Amino acid sequence: NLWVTVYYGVPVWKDAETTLFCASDAKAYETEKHNVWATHACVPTDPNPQEIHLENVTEEFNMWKNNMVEQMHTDIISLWDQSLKPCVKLTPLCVTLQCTNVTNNITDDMRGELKNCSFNMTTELRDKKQKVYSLFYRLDVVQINKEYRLINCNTSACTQACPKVSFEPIPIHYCAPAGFAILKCKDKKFNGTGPCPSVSTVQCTHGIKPVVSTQLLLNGSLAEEEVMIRSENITNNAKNILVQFNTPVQINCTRPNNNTRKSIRIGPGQAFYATGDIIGDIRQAHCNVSKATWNETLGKVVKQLRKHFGNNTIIRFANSSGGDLEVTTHSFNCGGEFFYCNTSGLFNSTWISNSNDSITLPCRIKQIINMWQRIGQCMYAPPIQGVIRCVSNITGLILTRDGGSTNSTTETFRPGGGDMRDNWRSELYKYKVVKIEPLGVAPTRCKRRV
Amino acid sequence: NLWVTVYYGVPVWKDAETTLFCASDAKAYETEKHNVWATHACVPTDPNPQEIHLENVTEEFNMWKNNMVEQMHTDIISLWDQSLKPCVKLTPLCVTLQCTNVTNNITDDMRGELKNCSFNMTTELRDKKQKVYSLFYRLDVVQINKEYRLINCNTSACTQACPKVSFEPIPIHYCAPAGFAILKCKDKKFNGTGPCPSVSTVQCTHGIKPVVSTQLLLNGSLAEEEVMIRSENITNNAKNILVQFNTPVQINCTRPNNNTRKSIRIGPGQAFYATGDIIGDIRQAHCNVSKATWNETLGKVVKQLRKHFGNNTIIRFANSSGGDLEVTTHSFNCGGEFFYCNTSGLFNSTWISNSNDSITLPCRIKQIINMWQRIGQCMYAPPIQGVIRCVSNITGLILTRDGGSTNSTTETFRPGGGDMRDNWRSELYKYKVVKIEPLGVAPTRCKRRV
Amino acid sequence: NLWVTVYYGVPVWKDAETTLFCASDAKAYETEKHNVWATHACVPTDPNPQEIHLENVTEEFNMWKNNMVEQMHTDIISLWDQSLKPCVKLTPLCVTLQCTNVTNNITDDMRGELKNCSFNMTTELRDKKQKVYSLFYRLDVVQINKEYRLINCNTSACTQACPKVSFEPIPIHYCAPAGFAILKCKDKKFNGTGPCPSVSTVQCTHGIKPVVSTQLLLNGSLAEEEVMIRSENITNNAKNILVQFNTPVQINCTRPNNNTRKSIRIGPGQAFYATGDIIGDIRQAHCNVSKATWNETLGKVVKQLRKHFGNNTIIRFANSSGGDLEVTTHSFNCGGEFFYCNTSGLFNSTWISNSNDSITLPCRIKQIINMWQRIGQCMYAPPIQGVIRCVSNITGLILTRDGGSTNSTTETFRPGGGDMRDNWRSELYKYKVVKIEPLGVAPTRCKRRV
């Protein structure tokens, strides 16, 4: 009665995984600064996205099982590794440093944050030796028992971030090969999982800034309206909670020092850049955030939190309960200088369901860093001449509720940045990759004559 | 009257050379053993090979011109070199050693086989000498004229094998690409070359262990119902003769010493493992093979050796001719320690053409090896903790005839490991790679419609 | 009335740019000797090229915008750098050299050309040192404040030239990939730009020797029956002028000294080759060119220069103004040693349009070279023992104009090798690569059957 007919090219897809390839705007070429996330091999992006909107279709998404974030995690590390493959491997610097405190003009709080170190080195000629000095932060030198040594020397040698390549993030687009498509969930209420009433296929994702941060997401994508709380399992106490502000709050971080870069010649053709001296007064690094906006912003976060825990509980915010400096402070880089800001001045409040001082958050700067939770890998950031200042956009917020007493009288939330790939999950949660299945069959009344 | 007609997909093949790719089982993949042969990158194989039998077809075979052997050799070498790249190079070990004989607990025969050596090294800080000592075998040190030096210093620096990776052989399957095929010769009597009445094609070869040995094939395949002898030209004297047993001969090897590994910290993040003190007495290593099951094995071999040499010749066996240690002594590794055994006790007998004593073969251990007859590349196997004992099958044997001055009076056979391909040749002798030729033309009584 | 019909495989092409691959003869690879331009991996060339001559077709050939030169310039650098990767780094050689003048048997001209240097050098063992001596050319040393040092020490270290790889150029063929084509211009008066009535297609270009030189094109391709002048814009002065002799002039370059190579063993697994002493007396290097055949060549060149500058102006030749040795003198590497010949004795003449002295050109040898006018890379060609004699053709000449004082009566031309890619631009001026477009549509009277 019915005969099978084969149709080729029908619009059917299926979830799967592939290897998305890079794509970025050609404006990066004009920079000619050899960005660490090399755009030279990235295919140029299209002049304008072609956002095809699909009518009357629903698809299932899961931002936490998304493979795009996992693939990006590997790519960012791989791009970073390839950059520090041709740069000075600061092996010779493991020598007995003879350091002393600096007390030229020092504030009481900044008593011993940095030291004045002197050590021997080798001129371009092996036979000759030269005595040089440099200023090392107290977080990069440890004592023997005034013998001092670098923290890296008993773990691994640190490469020395080339002084040309730049750490400034630039937008990138992760685009699928032919035979695969990316679906964007335009739904304004899609939290973490479920059928999106509106799904639109796109050529590939928009610009994604690879901004690495802890306890706070900077320069991110804001929600169109309302604040959103994202998590796989709200009840679980050992699960991170992601937030997204509908409006941004600016934070101004500055290093008011006047460090002067000094060049030290070690070996033939290899130079080690170290801080020479300090010009003018010495003041501790800090970040300024307006209390008026933050308290208003924090009030919105509490409003949505009460939805999943009842509209009578007492929501309390507390600082991190422990860990090393990397996980217990807000970490980021601002124009090639890495900050570690004590963020305990923000998460201290209580809500019982009922001027422009610009709150200051003291910060510290580190030169020997890992920033991938890896042992045996390291990098040394040379100093930056003159003062440095930058302004950011605090859009996201990572929190981890902890504790339990069999009583819902109050819930306490603390910042948490254990998972360093959650920065990008907050941007790729709207995307999923599918593979098309053009072949298909369907019975009909057509019969092949011959 | 007939007309040319074309066919596509006909079963026709021609001999060809291609690049077979690896394939290994995933059962042990999750163990994270990190073998020297990167089986993690090998595509998982099918649960069972697709043994397809081809009837009424005879295929020529040549185990000596087969390219599967030559390709395998370069894969093993490439894998071995690829695994030594990340390990630490022991370049700073070339120092004037000051060694003395050890006589704490020594037997008469093992008088000066190892030395107590002391040498000054530099610590993580590159301006402080640290005096350390280690135990070195007599084969890894030479005199200057009281003071010794490592034998490899005047050839090249050596990279020690990382303890994380293991030298345990594991099966690997070589599977050809699409459009090619592999033919298995199922004939039982197929000696070295010629038509194979029973030919079958498989998805790809069975697991082959990359075992490296000399004069004795361990953990190899067994020829059933007979003991086989392979040789491209039996008459030619300078052609290694390969013997494949039908029942394995067990061999037990042990190192009674109980040395304790000692770690020495050199440079940043790099550690060199010394030998450390010896617990208990020191005894020479040895290998045991039962004479009851070995003497009768020779009788089987002699019976087949007479077919190609006459039924009245006198068969004689003598030890190796002599020369370099690696070629004149049975060598292997079990437990990660390389042995070099003296097999003079096995090949010493004569036949006139007509009590588990457990023969013990003394063996010596070497820490500096090349293993590929290569100059400029060396490896340093770190010492293992505790006693090591291994049990293996002798499923094969190699011989090299000598003499021939008399017309036909007697024959003398000696072992020989001159070529390194014989170990894998005995496993790949059943396989041949061919390429398919789907196109074909045959006349028939047919015409085009227009 | 008409219907469009599609034709597949039509003869139509378009200008395009691709990545050509290599093709070399078997003789170079058959020797089994290693070459800097490793043609062993390069695929074998066809037995003969099939130069199909097209008819009635004209193409707009261009040599100044051709990408073949740009691709080949980068390709040559890559192979040259690749061959130096496994060689030995001479970084233990940066020490305070203590040199003195040598006056064993010195010619009047070659007084301070080379110096006798001694220094402290390392040894296989870390705790032992050796004192060695060598003769270094004056161009390779500089006073530290007597105490000298290698010039490259204060820029970058010098990777030694491996002693087996030879710089002997060998012809190579560039073959376009499938789907592309190469067009050859058979016109015998093609001036580099404009329509070429005689066009042909070749699957591979002729063998091009990668000869690197300055001010003179050696071992090139000769024109027939006339001398041709190539230039982007004759009026412009910043643009170089290319000449191509129809007949060659033979130049004999010799190094009369009889240097003796000496091997100094530094560190484990690496050796440094140095120059011991000069058997016999020491004489300056030079090159011989006959006066009779060179005056005629300039007579042909000046005749053609009059077409583009009038038939009454005075044509003058002057030596190079100034600059670095790599640009103000003729350079070449024949016999494995790098020369820098002072060609001021050739370009000194004045023509107003109205015996075998064998001109001798003094040359200075150098051992620390940076061939790819890069900055940072260095190479050290080891000395070659024995007297070396060299014979070469001169089949080209690069010239530059100085300017005009509003009077065309006198015009002076000087040699110049500023850009390294003009050498290969003289061999690829007849070639261009095009893309094959087989799809085409034309109207005919053909209705679809159904």
Epitope: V95 | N120, R126 | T122, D127
Partner: antibody, heavy 140, light 112 residues
Framework: QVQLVQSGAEVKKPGSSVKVSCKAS????????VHWVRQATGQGLEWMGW????????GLAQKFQGRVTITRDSGASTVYMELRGLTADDTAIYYC?????????????????????????????????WGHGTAVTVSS | VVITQSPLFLPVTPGEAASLSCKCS???????????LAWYLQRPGQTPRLLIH???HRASGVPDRFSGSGSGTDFTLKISRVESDDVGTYYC?????????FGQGTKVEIKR
Amino acid sequence: QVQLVQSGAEVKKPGSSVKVSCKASGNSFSNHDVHWVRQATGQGLEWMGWMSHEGDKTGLAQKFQGRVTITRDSGASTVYMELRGLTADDTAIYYCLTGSKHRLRDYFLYNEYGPDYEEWGDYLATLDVWGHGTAVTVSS
Amino acid sequence: VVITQSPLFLPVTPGEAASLSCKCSHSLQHSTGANYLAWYLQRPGQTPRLLIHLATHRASGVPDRFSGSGSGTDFTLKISRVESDDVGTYYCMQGLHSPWTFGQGTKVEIKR
């Protein structure tokens, strides 16, 4: 013949601190080493201390450990010495003199890419011209 | 470290050669290897004057009569035509190993 001057003779009771001064014309301390020696009637000479012309390294005998100090003024204009534990048997005559040293290398391990680990040492070569000296006696 | 010299006394007639030797417990070739020897003449009531250093070279202005030789752990000083002007005590000094100390010394008197 370089003229040299020394402080005049002084007498102090046992178990007390004293100060002495010595100066050299031409600032010869820059390129010469200074040692202190004493002599007693019927007995041989005895060395007390020394200083390197670099001024980096100094040393004394094991018996003088923790009881003798050497100080120099800025610019090497003058130097002063401190004496402790005087005894009636310590009668002798002080002297001012220069010296020379032979600084050689005893050991070296060749670090790959970093500063070498060298063990330097000093060996006294000769005693240069002496001065007229100063006589010091202990009595009570 | 200890140092000894001998003989304590040895009368020498004027115009006759004399030999004196000084040694220390540590061998001159103990660790580094070199002489580092110094010879001084102690004129009574006057400062000592260096004669020869290391027994290998003679200081400028010193008479050529003084000479030295020997090897190993023992060395001797050879002087031709001894004169009463050399009467005094001779002290040997070592610079091989710190601390640096003088020898005990010996006295030579003209026979009378």
